[PDB]
Nucleic acid binder design. Structure first.
Ligand SMILES: [Mg+2]
Ligand SMILES: [Mg+2]
Ligand SMILES: [Mg+2]
Ligand SMILES: [Mg+2]
Ligand SMILES: [Mg+2]
Ligand SMILES: [Mg+2]
Ligand SMILES: [Mg+2]
Ligand SMILES: [Mg+2]
Ligand SMILES: [Zn+2]
Lengths: 100, 114, 127, 99, 151, 82, 224, 211
RNA sequence: CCGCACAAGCGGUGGAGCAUGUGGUUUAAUUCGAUGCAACGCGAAGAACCUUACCUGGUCUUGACAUCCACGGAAGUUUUCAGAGAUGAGAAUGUGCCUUCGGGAACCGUGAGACAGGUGCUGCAUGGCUGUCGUCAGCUCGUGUUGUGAAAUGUUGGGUUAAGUCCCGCAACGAGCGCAACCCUUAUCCUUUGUUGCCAGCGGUCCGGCCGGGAACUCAAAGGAGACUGCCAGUGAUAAACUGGAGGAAGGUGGGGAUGACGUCAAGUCAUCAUGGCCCUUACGACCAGGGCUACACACGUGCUACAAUGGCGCAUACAAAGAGAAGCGACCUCGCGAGAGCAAGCGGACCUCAUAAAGUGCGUCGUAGUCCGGAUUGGAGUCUGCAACUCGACUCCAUGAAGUCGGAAUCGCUAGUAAUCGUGGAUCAGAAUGCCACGGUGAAUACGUUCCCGG
């Protein structure tokens, strides 16, 4: 769709990227059983200081081929229309219309 | 019967007579019975006071009947009085647990209107 | 000697073994009345042998897998008949005419798209 | 001492040519094979709306069937393993060699 | 059935009793294939029939049928512009079905606390030309003769 | 109920504003977009405007509200019937 | 054929006096028992003069089409054509068989292709039901065009039995200029037959006489 | 109504895929999208290379592409320098040691793609579509096809409404699975807009799979 | 002449509650589109943020993203200050690499515009695609002949058929798109291969196919071979065809899918995409926070769950299928009333895990009532997910205990493994399934018929 949306998703991804390590350790700490209760406290506080788009939740599985958000084939990440087209000309190897 | 819960439940299987008490549910009924140690299907009839007192005590431990109703009424009164969202909805008689305001909410909505 | 079989059904399959001289029936290391919680199952598994009238002449070692108790018992009766056949081959005709070499293939159908079931159609309010 | 090789494919013809090549290279070095023993091949169904706007009823069903072969050789010589090392295959064939 | 006439798949004799009308019976009373619970309901009731009616409960089945079995039916269509209540006679299998339905619903409507008790109460009634099954048979054997004006 | 192993949740800059209230006391009713942060015993007897989505309504904080969240007092869907 | 040879076979026999055609009066001896009697005095010389033309055509490498669709006489006419290495129509005559020659040629090609394919193979590649269906289609084509698969082109001469029954064939022939030799019963219209033989067309004996004499003279014309 | 795509339905039956590589769920979407990009690049650059088939397999590690076309030495240009820098750009877009291969088809008339593409070219040459498809179908059939069907769609002749047309020739049965029917879709971009074209050729029935 | 067309059945709908859609109504906004068939648990296979196009506010203007030209800087990293953030001001850190040392790439910023940008409008400008008639049996052509010719013939008639299915009569015949069939799938058997699959025979075994062993059987999955009214009689133009039987795992296109001749509907969609015209461009562009997309006088649809003793409850116990999985399934252990938590095996999986089928059955209990029915609804306290569960997530425990005691007219759906029930999984997904695509368990009733309805 709108190129703004596409680039925006790219940015969300790259941003979730370079904070992965800190997010991991902070999840650990705040989840750490028997944390200092302050180390855990100021930990979760500092976590709410990271850029929001470092979470995976802000992301949205987006069609690689089109940028259609809905009908996301998490196996191919394509629009529900595109995966059928790949079957129609025989792009996905070995694929065929099933009949069982 | 003339148990701590003023109500005189059915002279039937203990728990059936117990959950009958307001504020006493199946859990409360069986847990109170566990302390007595009497059978699940013992009727109120054929049971002496020597245990009725005991169960009256075991339910005196918990807050039940009118006292529980007053606590539930308070847990909602002040809630409304704080003007909290669910309190305003309780004032408007609305489902405060986030349900479809559009249709088939007649439970708290009440009767049917055109 | 030994006489085997393979009775199939909607979702069960049962190996079958005839060792003559008896009528006991070991099934998945169980006894029939102990194997099943349903009696008519035992009845319908007796049916073929009851017709051939040879109860305590051959014991059975059998093994059924998959599917539901009825499909089980059906596969059982089938493999029974198959063993009866490969033990007689004169009574192949006897059970064919008895209608026990049927190999029933009655099976569920795939749930087709747009159908609340495999065949049931949605409650389309025509009006 | 065993050498196992899984093969995952999409058509059983190609995988059959591949297994033929495998067992023949095996018997060149006189390897000791346990046979193809085809394994449960996997079937992947997929139904997607074929209509861009407002048509839940219209759907098309596809499926991927990864055919599945396994070879085992209990006495790999060097002249066995060199073959799989110097092995010649197609593209859509998938190999998985292991002890 | 515009070209061929199909009906119901051929029943099989109950292995537990050897008879067959019991099989069609339990199937009419059967729901979703609740076979076990349904044969337990009918066997338990024929047993106490074999006592409350003396022996011949399997024959008391027919003692109920012939007392309640319908002889006439009505089937109206738009052959010329409107309907008419026409009495007509049918082959025995259809009246088998009707009488079985009559004693299947006779038991259910009464309720009698439990299914086994309700079924047992009606089997006797139908066996002895009283009650509701033979009564709804009287309905069809009564309204039919009054509307024998034409066909 | 979010959880108990994590304790309540309140914003960084909201804590800044509340500690400004601490050092200052009764002041200009602070404002936030974050109706999600948790009330704390510090912010008592004061008020704060928070965005209804278009405008920030001032809620005067009291004790019993502590521990609750802000969005339970800042409506965003209005209604006058039909 | 001599008048005595015909008469014993019954060539003089004809249809009822109720059912005759007007142009046949010259060829009719008279009537007996309300039955038309054909005159052999005309029949014999005309048949001989037609045999002369048939011998001539066959002696210049002519292709001859024997035509008759009677259910009784179909095999007789087929065998008659086989006895002189010629082509025949013994089943229902298709409309425009001669005029729509191109369609028949496509049908002839298809019949040849099916028989060649069965000999070559690929029936095993076909499903057994398909192979059986292909055999049935080949049999149907052989039943329809058994006689004219090897005709190659339009014939040089036509021999017709009961010209009234086969009137479409003679109309086609006249439209093509192909000569018509025909056994013409009293009920037929003789305009379409350039060498007309008036005689019985139903009786098996006289039909076989016609066919045998024609085939003997055709083999004679071929031999040279 | 909305008919079945013919090449999709005959795939494997008689039709091979345009990609073969075996992969796994992890290395699949990435894989196929890389393949998309390389295909598309080739399409745009090979607008003149008369590309008919662009198949791409990813062997175990390497990947090879194969192009069936009709500009063989032209696709090669001179010494493959063109296709050589192509090998470079495909290795770089695919991150794989590239393996370019080409094998022309001598019967461009006898595909469904190249013919429709010529048709669209002449469509932007503003030729009359009807005469164009006539030309094409006769060339192909005369050459030895067993049947051709063509179709074009959209405001034909600069129309103010989308007049369609379909034309048949020879024999094209689209319910006999043993048959081979090459099919293709293409487009032309008029000043008035876009016009679809679809092309089928039935070329006799195959016996024994791809073999 | 036809179709679950009616009929005959079977279970519903319409009553209840709840879910779920739509339209109202409201909003600052409740984004757009879908609108009898052929909209309406629609597009969405899954809106807390994101999504979001929408409101409000916050801001930007060659720009979020594209290319080109300079000017500069390695690229980077990490942290502070302010902001609600978007963002502004920084401070540190690195300052490289290929070099023909001149430059260049990666990229970063500034300028400059040449430009970008649009989910702006226009499905009556279109492409592409899909719904429908309808898998209804038709639709046509060549050639022929018929007439001077509009045309006709076939395509007709008599039979017969799932069928323009077939045959015969026959100025028609012959082909083509169809129909059929070749596909997949399923039912019998045979060959091959037998580990992670099998355990018949064997011994051992703590009894666990476990362990030697076994290759049989079961499966596995490649080959196959099969069903043709082939048989027989009954018919019947002796014709097709049909009746019935035999044989047979299977019989009369075995079972099921895939496959939609034409065309029809300016059917639907420019918000998948593509695209003609216009269309704003400091904004109809862009960026951020919050909101809304979840409102409710309502209406209308679609569903779920109930109204009970074939039931409820407790205890005991049997039988499935199909799947999925490595920022994954995750057992095991322990704890926790549970939701869970910790611990951590195993497994990219015929190997580990999910994953421990429900209905069933056995036993006891209830004994018919707004009930031990029903469970909504509110209370309390959690659980878990993610920055974040007010607006609005899922989920446990405690407590409550609405209506409902079978639902007018009207009406739906269904021909066998079907209905109807009982569970299972999958897609999408941090999380969020009564839906949907799937799977097995159980397994019915009814067809006199075509006179009727509907449609062809
Ligand atoms: Mg765009
Ligand atoms: Mg998400
Ligand atoms: Mg719009
Ligand atoms: Mg079809
Ligand atoms: Mg018609
Ligand atoms: Mg926002
Ligand atoms: Mg919505
Ligand atoms: Mg209960
Ligand atoms: Zn005559």
């Amino acid at each position: 769709a709108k190129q703004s949306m596409k680039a925006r998703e790219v940015k969300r991804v790259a941003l979730a990227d370079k904070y992965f390590a800190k997010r991991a350790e902070l999840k650990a700490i705040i989840s750490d059983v028997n944390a200092s209760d302050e180390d855990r406290w100021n930990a979760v506080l500092k976590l709410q200081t990271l850029p929001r788009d470092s979470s995976p939740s802000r992301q949205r599985n987006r069609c690689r081929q089109t940028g259609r958000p809905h009908g996301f084939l998490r196996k191919f990440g394509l629009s529900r229309i595109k995966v059928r087209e790949a079957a129609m000309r025989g792009e996905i190897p070995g694929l065929k219309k099933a009949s069982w | 019967a003339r148990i701590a819960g003023i109500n005189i439940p059915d002279h039937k299987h203990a728990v059936i007579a117990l959950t009958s008490i307001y504020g006493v549910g199946k859990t409360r009924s069986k847990a109170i019975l566990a302390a007595a140690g009497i059978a699940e299907d013992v009727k109120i009839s054929e049971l002496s006071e020597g245990q009725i007192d005991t169960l009256r005590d075991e339910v005196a431990k918990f807050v039940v009947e009118g006292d529980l109703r007053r606590e539930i009424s308070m847990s909602i009164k002040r809630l409304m009085d704080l003007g909290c969202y669910r309190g305003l909805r309780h004032r408007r008689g609305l489902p405060v647990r986030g349900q479809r305001t559009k249709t088939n909410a007649r439970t708290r909505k009440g009767p049917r209107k055109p | 000697n030994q006489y085997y079989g393979t009775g199939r059904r909607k979702s069960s399959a049962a190996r079958v073994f005839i060792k003559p001289g008896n009528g006991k029936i070991v099934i998945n290391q169980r006894s029939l009345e102990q194997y099943f919680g349903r009696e008519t199952a035992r009845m319908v598994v007796r049916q073929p042998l009851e017709l051939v009238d040879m109860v305590e002449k051959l014991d059975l070692y059998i093994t059924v897998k998959g599917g539901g108790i009825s499909g089980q018992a059906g596969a059982i009766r089938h493999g029974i008949t198959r063993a009866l056949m490969e033990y007689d081959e004169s009574l192949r005709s006897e059970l064919r005419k008895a209608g026990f070499v049927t190999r029933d293939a009655r099976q569920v159908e795939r749930k087709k798209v747009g159908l609340r079931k495999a065949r049931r159609r949605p409650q389309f309010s025509k009006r | 001492q065993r050498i196992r090789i899984r093969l995952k494919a999409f058509d059983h013809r190609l995988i059959d040519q591949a297994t033929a090549e495998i067992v023949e290279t095996a018997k060149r070095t006189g390897a000791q094979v346990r046979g193809p023993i085809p394994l449960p091949t996997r079937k992947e169904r997929f139904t997607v709306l074929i209509s861009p706007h407002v048509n839940k009823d219209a759907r098309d069903q596809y499926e991927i069937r990864t055919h599945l072969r396994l070879v085992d050789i209990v006495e790999p010589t060097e002249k066995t393993v060199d073959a799989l090392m110097r092995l010649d295959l197609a593209a859509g064939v998938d190999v998985q060699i292991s002890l | 059935p515009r070209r061929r006439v199909i009906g119901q798949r051929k029943i099989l004799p109950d292995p537990k009793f050897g008879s067959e009308l019991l099989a069609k019976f339990v199937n009419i009373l059967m729901v979703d294939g609740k076979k076990s619970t349904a044969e337990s309901i009918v066997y338990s009731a024929l047993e106490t029939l074999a006592q409350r009616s003396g022996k011949s409960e399997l024959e008391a089945f027919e003692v109920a049928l012939e007392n309640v079995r319908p002889t006439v039916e009505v089937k109206s269509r738009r052959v010329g512009g409107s309907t008419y209540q026409v009495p007509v006679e049918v082959r025995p299998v259809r009246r088998n079905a009707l009488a079985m339905r009559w004693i299947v619903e006779a038991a259910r409507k009464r309720g009698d606390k439990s299914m086994a008790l309700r079924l047992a109460n009606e089997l006797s009634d139908a066996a002895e030309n009283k009650g509701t099954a033979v009564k709804k048979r009287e309905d069809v054997h009564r309204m039919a003769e009054a509307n024998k004006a034409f066909a | 109920p979010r959880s108990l192993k994590k304790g309540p949740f309140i914003d960084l800059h909201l804590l800044k504003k509340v500690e400004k209230a601490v050092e200052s006391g009764d002041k200009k009713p602070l404002r936030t977009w974050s109706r999600r942060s948790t009330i704390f015993p510090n912010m008592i007897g004061l008020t704060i405007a928070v965005h209804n989505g278009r405008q920030h309504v001032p809620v005067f904080v009291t004790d019993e509200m502590v521990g609750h969240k802000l969005g339970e007092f800042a409506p965003t869907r209005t209604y006058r019937g039909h | 054929v001599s008048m005595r040879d015909m008469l014993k076979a019954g060539v003089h026999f004809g249809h009822q006096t109720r059912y005759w055609n007007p142009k046949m009066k010259p060829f009719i001896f008279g009537a007996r028992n309300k039955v038309h009697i054909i005159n052999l005095e005309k029949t014999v010389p005309m048949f001989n003069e037609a045999l002369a033309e048939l011998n001539k055509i066959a002696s210049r490498k002519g292709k001859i089409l024997f035509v008759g669709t009677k259910r009784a006489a179909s095999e007789a006419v087929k065998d008659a054509a086989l006895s002189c290495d010629q082509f025949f129509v013994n089943h229902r005559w298709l409309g425009g068989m001669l005029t729509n020659w191109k369609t028949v040629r496509q049908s002839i090609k298809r019949l040849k292709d099916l028989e060649t394919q069965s000999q070559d193979g690929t029936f095993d590649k076909l499903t057994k039901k398909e192979a059986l269906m292909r055999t049935r289609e080949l049999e149907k084509l052989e039943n329809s065009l058994g006689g004219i698969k090897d005709m190659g082109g339009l014939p040089d001469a036509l021999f017709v039995i009961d010209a009234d029954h086969e009137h479409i064939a003679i109309k086609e022939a006249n439209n093509l200029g192909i000569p018509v030799f025909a056994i013409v019963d009293t009920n037929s219209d003789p305009d379409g037959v350039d060498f007309v033989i008036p005689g019985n067309d139903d009786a098996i004996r006289a039909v076989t006489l016609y066919l045998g004499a024609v085939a003997a003279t055709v083999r004679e014309g071929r031999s040279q | 109504g909305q008919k079945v795509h013919p090449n999709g339905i005959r795939l494997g039956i008689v039709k091979p895929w345009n990609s073969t590589w075996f992969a796994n769920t992890k290395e699949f979407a990435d894989n196929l999208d890389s393949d998309f990009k390389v295909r598309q690049y080739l399409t745009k650059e090979l607008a003149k290379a008369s590309v008919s088939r662009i198949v791409i397999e990813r062997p175990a590690k390497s990947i090879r592409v194969t192009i069936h076309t009709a500009r063989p030495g032209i696709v090669i240009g001179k010494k493959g320098e063109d296709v050589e820098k192509l090998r470079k750009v495909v290795a770089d877009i695919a991150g794989v040691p590239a393996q370019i291969n080409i094998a022309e088809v001598r019967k461009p008339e006898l595909d469904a793609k190249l013919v429709a593409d010529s048709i669209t070219s002449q469509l932007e040459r503003r030729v009359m579509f009807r005469r164009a498809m006539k030309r094409a179908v006769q060339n192909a059939m005369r050459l030895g096809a067993k049947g051709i069907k063509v179709e074009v769609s959209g405001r034909l002749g600069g129309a103010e409404i989308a007049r369609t047309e379909w034309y048949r020739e020879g024999r094209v049965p689209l319910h006999t699975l043993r048959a081979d029917i090459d099919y293709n879709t293409s487009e032309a971009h008029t000043t008035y807009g876009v016009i679809g074209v679809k092309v089928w050729i039935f070329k006799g029935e195959i016996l024994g799979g791809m073999a």
